[PDB]
Paper text:
Prenylated FMN consists of an FMN molecule modified by the addition of a fourth non-aromatic ring joined via N5–C1′ and C6–C3′ linkages between the flavin and prenyl moieties. Following binding of prFMNreduced and formation of holo-UbiD, the cofactor undergoes oxidation to form the catalytically relevant oxidized [name] species.
However, when [name] is incubated in the dark, activity remains constant for many hours, even under aerobic conditions. Hence, we repeated the purification of [name] in the dark, revealing that the latter exhibits slightly higher activity (kcat = 9.3 ± 0.1 s−1) compared with the protein purified under ambient light (kcat = 7.6 ± 0.2 s−1). The respective enzyme preparations exhibit different UV-visible spectra, with the “dark” protein preparation displaying a prominent feature at 380 nm and showing subtle differences between 340 and 385 nm compared with protein purified under normal light conditions. High-resolution crystal structures of [name] purified and crystallized in the dark reveal that the [name] cofactor is exclusively in the iminium form.
Author numbering:
A (entry chain A), B (entry chain A): 4 to 499, 502 to 505
Write the structure that this text describes.
């Protein structure tokens, strides 16, 4: 099976790429696996595959860390991501995000039901497993639980059957047969949960699939629209219908090649302690436990030699930056275009801890709008900050066409030199806020509301007559023929490869 | 003579350091020299010495570019700066700034007058030079003039004789015997000029010395207090009295080893066209010429084989970032401490285009103040933004003790995650603004007023009971003995020098 359609094949692809380190000696899931993974993510090293995990029994489980993290070289920086999507490993961010957006104007390709698959190679019923006996990792020293779920896909369906959502949300072991996790507004798992709670008749049928098709875990991390079934979006994006098998104990369907599948229910009534967790913005607040959603596990099925993917998330750079930030930015780009805003590109700079999105403006189109910064800032912020795709983002930075939003140094240059604090900004207090940012949930104001801003780094003539500067840089402040002379004589004169 | 006391010796030191490229074939001062220098500054390469400058006659002049720019290696990143100050080339920023501040609580060491020096080896009177015939560089393709003065020191004295100021301010050739340049409030050259204008009797006696003692050009770029003669501050900092010789045509004194000296007057009445220039924030606005101060040159004296230092300034990284930003930050650190604010460190992040200063707070001291963010932000902003040392700085970022302000990634992390936009900020509109920032002089509001902000990246418990998080990083989220195991087994397992 192709790498983008089968996690086991994705692991092979990373090996083949010289992007994997296989560790075959015993590694402790209590912190060691995650510490190694953390170091990988902070240094952009090869992904670690822990084949000898202390506490692994009857095939559960090996761990792959850093599945969506960065490579060291600039030329294949995003290559792990590219390998989720059948793209060349040198694909740019723009190409990755375009691939992720491509299904938005295509018919869905619904999934195909098949009678079995590798995820049925082994099973454990309700008398045979104990989640506290599996080698679930402690990912950060102060975590409030062993976070089994950092890179699997929750599967829940609306009561009417018309929408089946796939998404990543964290969860940790509660006891032998339960998890607790985050289920928070405006996320689709929360929206579906609320539908079941209003109906009031039963707990939500649920599955959690680990080691799913890489193209599916990417969509699972993207805020595609309300009511859109991710399986059909992934089918359209990849050009192929995904193969799913039915759960044994419920009527949900899971990818056939899933490494590990939990089947059970998400309670409409019960909660349990959840967190704290070392989170995407780089912090953990020890002791900060709160009631979270509670899942009951009735069945486990799994591949022979099952592999659990794991995100050791925190400070730069890991899946919570490369996927949450970039895929939200992608959706925001589309949302602005569909609202008739002249946005060409969007990216969440890593330097902002993916709390900003830079929006590149087609300033020829802006000029024709015959508008002002105040009016344009307000329009952009109202579109983005009132929508779920803007949930995680607290600062939007508007930049003109000279800026590559995929280059954080250029975004920071433009922000710092073109946006006058206060005057060139509009604050938004009456919008949903992202509580996980420390300045929100642990800050001075409401954890769930406000704290957002549009920062206009467009210069005044970009609204009127056009850009009226040149950069004081090598590229723009010297003619072409001089530049090329300099370059051609560079090493000759005494001064100092793309791939590397 | 030591490198910090003699520019010619500084050039040797750079050679000795393997930090110089000597270019002995013809190089055009019309853009080529500055283009090469620009490329050096954007890539942190070796400093260029142009020994064969097209238009060099009778010894005027060779050019040294990038005198205060960065080296590629992390271990001696600031080594050019260190070589201005007799520090080891591996000196940290903290050590450099401490050296620059050290004279603030020492008695001045006044200069020593000597009868001659190398700067008298050659002279050209009022019938023998023409500034339009010298190989003055065109530094950026759209500049409004040939900027002879990017790294020399203007020398002006108060009418009463009690204060002699040394400072860098740009100037360009106007005609055979005049320059025009910036002379703007609140700068000391402007403050002294105003004293002469109020007296109304004569033009200001003036000298401009190029290739001065490196320790003197550093002080020339620092906002030491009003009324303090830089020569005595440099004497105290270096432990030695600087040797000066009298000008021929006026009673000012110049460093004995100056490479090139202009003597003349700064008009109290006349102005001439000045600019535009490719400036420190990375831009030039073509055509944006304004009336500037006008200098008359009556005499040139110079060393045999004189060398003109040149800053090819603009986008990162050059002297306008390494010296303007860092030395302002240094003075701001001291100013806050003298105002009883618990600031331990200050630095202007390069990523902010040196428009921000990050202030590291001793949070134990802050706790004992029993204050709040609103009150503390206001106090800090009032101290800094009402003072000349804060002139160039538009955003102050307050951070706690865990942040290394000399590390821009950490400042950006803290800003982005700990400062809630709006709520955690105080805007300052009734303070002097720095017009050279594009969003000021080419922006939506008053060019000279406002646009400043204090952004509080202290978390709430840092004011009360103490830090209540741990970072989700390798350093803080794993015990010491695990960390060290990981490190010790890193290359063994398969994963990947300080000097490089
Ligand atoms: C990539 C990724 C995405 C996480 C995530 C992580 C990763 C690695 C973790 C597990 C390591 C840390 C926490 N995560 C959560 C999360 N969303 C959320 O509601 N709760 C979370 O706990 N997300 C973001 C979530 O997947 C996106 O917001 C999706 O848009 C949600 O899908 P939906 O649009 O269908 O609701
Ligand atoms: C290092 C450096 C400092 C420049 C400078 C440059 C460099 C390389 C240039 C020449 C390349 C670009 C423009 N510069 C000017 C400037 N200050 C100013 O008033 N006008 C300027 O034109 N400065 C900053 C000035 O030197 C500091 O603000 C000093 O504190 C001024 O000294 P003072 O405190 O004695 O007034
Ligand atoms: K999703
Ligand atoms: K603006
Ligand atoms: K000075
Ligand atoms: K704060
Ligand atoms: Mn969804
Ligand atoms: Mn001064």
């Amino acid at each position: 099976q192709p790498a983008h359609l089968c996690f086991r094949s994705f692991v092979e692809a990373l090996k083949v790429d010289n992007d994997l380190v296989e560790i075959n000696t015993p590694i402790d899931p209590n912190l060691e696996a995650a510490a190694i993974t953390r170091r990988v993510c902070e240094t952009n090293d090869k992904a670690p595959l822990f084949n000898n995990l202390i506490g692994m029994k009857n095939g559960l489980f090996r761990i792959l860390g850093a599945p969506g993290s960065l490579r060291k070289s600039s030329a294949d920086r995003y290559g792990r991501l590219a390998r989720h999507l059948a793209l060349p490993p040198t694909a740019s961010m723009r190409e990755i995000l375009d691939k992720m957006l491509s299904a938005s104007d295509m018919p869905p390709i619904p999934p195909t039901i098949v009678p079995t698959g590798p995820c049925k190679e082994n099973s454990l019923d309700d008398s045979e497993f104990d989640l506290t006996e599996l080698p679930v990792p402690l990912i950060h020293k102060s975590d409030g639980g062993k976070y089994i779920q950092t890179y699997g896909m929750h599967i829940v369906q609306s009561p009417d059957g018309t929408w089946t959502n796939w998404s990543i949300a964290r969860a940790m072991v509660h006891d032998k047969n339960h998890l607790t996790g985050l289920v928070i507004p405006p996320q689709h798992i929360w929206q579906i949960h609320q539908m079941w709670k209003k109906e009031g008749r039963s707990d939500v049928p649920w599955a959690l699939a680990f080691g799913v098709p890489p193209a599916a875990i990417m969509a699972s991390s993207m805020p595609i629209p309300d009511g859109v079934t991710e399986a059909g979006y992934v089918g359209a994006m990849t050009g192929s219908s995904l193969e799913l098998v039915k759960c044994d104990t419920n009527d949900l369907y899971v990818p056939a090649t899933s490494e590990i599948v939990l089947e059970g229910t998400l309670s409409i009534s019960e909660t349990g302690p959840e967190g704290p967790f070392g989170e995407m913005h780089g912090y953990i607040f020890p002791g900060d436990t709160h009631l979270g959603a509670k899942y009951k596990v009735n069945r486990i099925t799994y591949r022979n030699n099952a592999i659990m993917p794991m995100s050791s998330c925190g400070r730069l750079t890991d899946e919570t930056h490369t996927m949450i930030g970039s895929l939200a930015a992608a959706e925001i780009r589309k949302l602005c275009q569909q609202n008739d805003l002249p946005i060409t590109d969007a990216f969440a700079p890593f330097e902002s801890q993916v709390t900003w999105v830079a929006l590149r403006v087609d300033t020829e189109k802006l000029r024709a709008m015959k508008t002002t910064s105040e009016g344009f800032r307000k329009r952009v912020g109202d579109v983005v900050f009132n929508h779920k795709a803007g949930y995680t983002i607290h600062r939007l930075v508007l930049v003109g066409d000279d800026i590559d939003v995929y280059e954080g140094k250029d975004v920071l240059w433009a922000f710092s030199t073109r946006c006058r604090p206060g005057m060139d900004e509009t604050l938004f207090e009456d919008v949903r806020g992202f509580p996980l940012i420390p300045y929100m949930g642990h800050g001075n104001g409401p954890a769930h509301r406000g704290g957002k801003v549009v920062s206009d780094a467009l210069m005044p003539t970009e609204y009127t007559t056009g850009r009226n500067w040149e950069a004081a840089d090598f590229n723009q402040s010297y003619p072409e023929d001089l530049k090329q002379k300099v370059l051609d004589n560079w090493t000759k004169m005494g001064f100092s490869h793309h791939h590397h």
